[PDB]
Nucleic acid binder design. Structure first.
Ligand code: MG
Ligand code: MG
Lengths: 220, 474, 474, 218
DNA sequence: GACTATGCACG
DNA sequence: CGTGCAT
DNA sequence: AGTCATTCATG
DNA sequence: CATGAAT
């Protein structure tokens, strides 16, 4: 079950894909219900590049997506939103889900991705604060150090270990309101490269993935 | 080995145990601090762990674990769910817990899992706990005998009426509508002076419920019935405006905005009434439900229908049942107010008794140092000529007939304390103490001096936390 | 505002982040203390909250809440489940947590919900933490910057080999069989002396795994392969006796007694083999599975079949992968042992450095009081002639050129301390300190004196915690 | 799903009804698997005297009971155990469940109850230790235990059965040699009916009175 | 990262 | 049906 | 007082 | 199909 926007207008209406019900609340609350829909997933999504067809289409979370979006898996297009936005918790488990959601779109809904309709939303991880209040936001470790230097002594630091942990006004002001938000727009600039890459990381083979890690993961 | 028991008798004990535990220990609020046990244990625990409005928030789950571990032998969900209710402004008039993150809403969306959220005690909550630490209140052991737990809170304000409460036990259920902190305290103070107070006069002060969700309340007559008897039915109507379209900006307490909206649109689709033509446009900071109408603006008929056929107008029922004297009573305003007052009396007296002892102790000690500052030379000389700390003490008691505590105090004095040899300063505190003691001794055995102090503190609390009415009376 | 990114690059970063965090921070054990993060955080937290073997147990859920709140930003279930594993004697050789109540079993029954159980740290666990408080180890901030958390533990014993570990991450998985604490430490000490040690000799000490579930291990050849390379396959056979009937009293590590039994009886019903004729009669204190046979006592064929066709005999696989230098290595015994040793070296040196500073400080202070006891009269006289505590201090520094800390110490001295004017006693401690400092300074810059101390402590740990072998070698 | 005894011998084999899976573990573990079966329920049981027939027979927990016992709801008898033993956590929520389980047996399986086959098992609530160790079953017992142990004693409260160990559950409340059981018999019928219908009934108004008049809120 | 069943009183 | 503490 | 989906590597 | 940390 989804929380849809008032107007049904596939020209300017966004679908916000979220990591769970708890985050879903935060989303539904801080949000412009005129053209913003919200669809919860139950945690980590099926690796669509490691399972078969039946296993996939049989899984609730993928199926619900397919339905609420329209087009279908073949695909076809214009339904149903001119933005499908992946908004996951700010940590690393969020980054995994992004990885999984993208491969699903890339594998099946390809035209969607090639079109330029898949977005990644970039919500804060850390908020640091020092009637007079000074407040900054960080998105990863490095940013934190610089923020800490700025605020020097006294500052309290808060870490949103999950989206349901920040308030409505916050989620809006930072990461949903188009005026002050910023989004990532995912495009594919080869096809061959994408296929190559996705199949290693997301693949089924391991042996190559491992190498890709050793050679490229900088464990400093 | 086998004990043979009947079915009647076994069913008897086993029921009686449970029915009792449920009534006292689970569901029903104390008439004194208007709290159910879980509430109280949350409040006490959080506060003891100094998790307070003025300091940073803290991971709800840590809070929950501690409550479970120290005080409350039950489910985490039961606890945290309860903790969350206490953070809900559309539910409570004056919130006792501030939670940062998603704690549900009027649309009814479920609160974020506990591992996600963070919480602290609110400001007014501190007032519920004020004086706790000065032996103001009866304690019991926790389930393990490891630590001691309050059996009721001090209660700077009449929380029972303020935040209402409900309400399901064996044999008894409770529903108590929220009230306007300001107006309540007015009632309290008036009774403090004129105890034999009749409901009619009290009503001039507490004129009926104040729902945090605003709304319109019509039923003067039955409200009195409720305030006298303890049971009553009242009518509550959402607050309507016409735009040139029906605009809804307040709805009936304990009602579900989300479903309320569906149920209305269902009226349109079923075309159960004429001009049905329904949208919810509500955002963080304001409630707005728009019912925009068609041609035949039979609007009055449409609105009047909506009131009847949907939950835009409902009735709220009074079942005011609290625990007084360890037992279920269905009580009116007069018993609640009175029993709260009498509580505050015990609190104040017990507090002062504790304060007085503390005063008298330091006073005896100060009286002591003042003597010493005159003999300092010979005193130190003695201490040096002494073998052990203990021997040191025993020698002063023998020679200068100082007391026991006086001795520890002189002996444990650090050294730079000698940097301050000045009977003037000590004499200043000595005055201070003597004046406090004499003030206190008054309150303790001065019954009206006691009641006045009550009235003052109460007024001070009204000034700090008072807020305009949200609900209107027709 | 919009940043435009490709699919390749985005997928690149996002994977790299996760793959990394999983490897270091979640799944794989540190090669130094052989712990995964959750383990470490549980241990540290429990211990900091002094929840220790010698004192009463404590409501698991309280423990879990604190871990979550302070150190570990994740699910309670993930945490508590992990905590529970650490309480499982059929899983770990040397348990690091003692849990009272139901924590599962060999039949595989699920552990009691956390709200039910109680837990403390075990005795040997303290040894993992020993010296933690004397700056022996690198700390980091917790996720909130509110409190500091160890990045590895001190590690009095080589936990990695002892309790093994597994083992699923991105790109890497790990399986490390438990080992005999005694035998391991033997290996360690030998290497400490002969670093250039070859596996063959080390094997004389650590001759292969020791499963807490007992059992028979056959595969000398492949065990070496494992100890050298890091990967190997070994055979493990349940331990059998014939009664005049087949009796089973030990089964293969990581195997499920309950299902194991069904799978056997399934053999009978399917009559997949001859004399199949299967009962489990096991109680609190002993494992017993009875396979009682029919007429044609083809028992040897039946047993030999059971080994092949069921999990009475399985193979255990070695995939010894730990985190060294912040990175995944697949390592043999030599790297593990060595890296552990070198760790203990840093620990010992860091410890001593901390101990030395503390010694030197009090020493400087004692050196100080010794001087004062000679000038006591004039010193006190000064203090009295002084205006403020601070002025008091500043005057001694000016006049008797005492130092800063020396001053605070003299000045804050309580009074009965004057009861003990005796340069002999202080001189006694002064000797004590000087001797400790000089001892320490040795260890710090004496490399062999350092290694010897390692060897001693290690031997002391072996004596305390050593236990007979449970698993046998064929 | 149940944990049955080795031998199937309706002459000496007991069925232990338990409040949940967590307690179930404790039971299964400390126990003589020769003639002791263990059957978990999912918490508070349906009030069989407040719901209809379909509502009842449709509820999993009652249905599982009916099956594992044999006889059936009509009833008939000798299946399947010569003891059906209600073993609930030691606190008051346990006492409620006992109340509910008994009415179900009383209402449907009546012959069972009249026969003398329904038992209540009486597991400890408090254990106090100074080693010297005693057990308490309710508040009052606690005070006397506290007086005995005087200073130093630690007190442990089993807030649920999965909180005590195997050896303990056995030695105290399951081993027939040292255990003690309550044997539930009905000594009227009319009185039983009368009583059950008030407490467990549907009417409230009478229940309430029964409380006021008889519940000593001291 | 979520969900389901029960008691209890009352309209 | 839902409400708030509980199993 | 319970339960379910999903990732990840390996046999 | 577990296994053991996670969503
Ligand atoms: Mg997350
Ligand atoms: Mg219970």
């Amino acid at each position: 079950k989804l929380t849809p926007a008032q107007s049904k207008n596939p020209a300017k209406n966004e679908l916000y894909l979220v990591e769970g019900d708890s985050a879903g609340g935060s989303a539904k609350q801080g949000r412009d219900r005129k053209f913003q829909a919200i669809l919860p997933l139950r945690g980590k999504v099926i690796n669509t590049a490691k399972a078969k067809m039946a296993d996939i289409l049989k899984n609730e979370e993928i199926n619900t997506m397919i339905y609420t979006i329209g087009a279908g898996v073949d695909f076809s297009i214009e339904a149903n939103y001119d933005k499908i936005i992946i908004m996951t918790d700010a940590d690393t488990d969020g980054a995994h889900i992004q990885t999984l959601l993208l491969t699903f779109f890339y594998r099946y809904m390809r035209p969607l991705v090639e079109a330029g309709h898949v977005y990644i939303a970039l919500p804060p991880l850390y908020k640091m604060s020092k009637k007079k209040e000074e407040v900054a936001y960080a998105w990863t470790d490095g940013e934190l150090e610089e923020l800490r230097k700025q605020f020097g002594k006294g500052a309290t630091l808060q870490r949103y270990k999950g989206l349901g942990e920040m308030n409505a006004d916050q989620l809006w002001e930072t990461t949903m309101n188009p005026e002050t938000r910023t989004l990532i727009r995912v495009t594919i600039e080869d096809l061959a490269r994408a296929e190559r890459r996705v199949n290693v990381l997301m693949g089924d083979k391991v042996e190559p993935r491992r190498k890709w890690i050793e050679d490229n993961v900088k464990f400093t | 080995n086998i004990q043979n028991m009947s079915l009647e008798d076994i069913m008897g004990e086993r029921f009686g145990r449970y029915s009792k535990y449920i009534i006292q220990d689970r569901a029903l609020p104390d008439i004194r601090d208007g709290l159910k046990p879980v509430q109280r244990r949350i409040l006490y625990s959080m506060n003891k762990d100094s998790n307070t409005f003025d300091k940073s928030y803290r991971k709800s789950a840590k809070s929950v674990g501690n409550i479970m571990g120290n005080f409350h032998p039950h489910g985490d969900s039961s606890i945290y769910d309860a903790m969350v209710r206490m953070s809900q402004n559309w539910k409570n008039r004056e919130i006792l817990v501030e939670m940062h993150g998603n704690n549900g809403s009027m649309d009814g969306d479920p609160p974020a899992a506990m591992r996600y959220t963070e919480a602290r005690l609110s400001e007014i909550a501190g007032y519920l706990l004020q004086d706790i630490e000065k032996k103001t209140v009866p304690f019991a052991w926790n389930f393990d005998d490891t630590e001691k737990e309050p059996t009721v809170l001090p209660a700077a304000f009449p929380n029972l009426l303020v935040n209402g409460s409900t309400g399901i036990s064996a044999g008894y259920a409770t529903d108590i509508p929220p009230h306007n902190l300001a107006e309540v305290i007015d009632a309290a103070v008036y009774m403090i002076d004129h105890p034999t107070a009749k409901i009619d006069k009290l009503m001039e002060f507490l004129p009926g419920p104040d729902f945090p969700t605003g709304a319109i309340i019509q039923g003067r007559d039955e409200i009195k019935k409720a305030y006298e008897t303890g049971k009553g039915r009242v009518v509550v109507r959402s607050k309507t405006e016409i735009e040139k379209q029906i605009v809804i900006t307040e709805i009936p307490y304990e009602i579900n905005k989300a479903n309320l909206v569906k149920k209305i649109d269902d009226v349109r689709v079923n075309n159960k009434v004429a001009g049905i033509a329904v949208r919810d446009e509500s955002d963080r900071d304001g409630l707005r439900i728009a019912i925009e109408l068609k041609k035949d603006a039979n609007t009055e008929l449409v609105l009047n229908y909506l009131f009847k056929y949907t939950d835009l107008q409902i009735n709220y029922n009074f079942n005011m049942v609290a625990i007084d004297n360890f037992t279920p009573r269905q009580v009116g305003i007069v018993p609640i107010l009175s029993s709260y007052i009498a509580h505050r009396r015990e609190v104040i007296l017990a507090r002062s008794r504790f304060d007085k002892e503390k005063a008298e102790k330091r006073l005896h000690i100060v009286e002591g140092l003042i003597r010493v500052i005159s003999i300092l030379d010979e005193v130190i000389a003695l201490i040096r000529a002494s073998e052990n700390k203990a021997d040191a003490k025993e020698n002063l008691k023998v020679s200068y007939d100082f007391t026991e505590e006086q001795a520890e105090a002189i002996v444990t004095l650090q050294l730079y304390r000698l940097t301050n040899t000045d009977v003037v300063v000590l004499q200043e505190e000595e005055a201070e103490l003597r004046e406090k003691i004499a003030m206190l001794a008054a309150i303790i055995g001065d019954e009206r001096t006691m009641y006045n102090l009550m009235k003052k503190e109460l007024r001070e609390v009204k000034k700090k936390f008072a807020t305009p009415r949200l609900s209107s009376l027709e």
